[PDB]
């Protein structure tokens, strides 16, 4: 999807997730931004597993 969504986030905070929603992400990582949106949580894809990563525990670092 995406949706004129382009970005990119480094992982401030080691999350494992757990839901299908989710993306896991390892403190130190970088991420491939989708929605952007939603503050609370960033749509992002990973490792062919896109869900939602948490913007408080990510960086723009990119």
């Known amino acids: ?16 997730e757990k839901s299908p929603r989710e993306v896991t992400m390892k403190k130190g990582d970088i991420l ?5 949106t939603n ?5 992002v894809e990973v490792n062919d597993r896109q ?4 913007a408080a525990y990510v960086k723009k670092l990119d």
Request: glycine fraction near 6%.
């Open 51 to 54: 869900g939602f990563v948490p």
């Open 1 to 16: 999807m995406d949706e004129t969504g382009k970005e990119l986030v480094l992982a401030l905070y080691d999350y494992q």
């Open 32 to 36: 491939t931004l989708l929605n952007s």
């Open 39 to 43: 503050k609370d949580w960033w749509k």
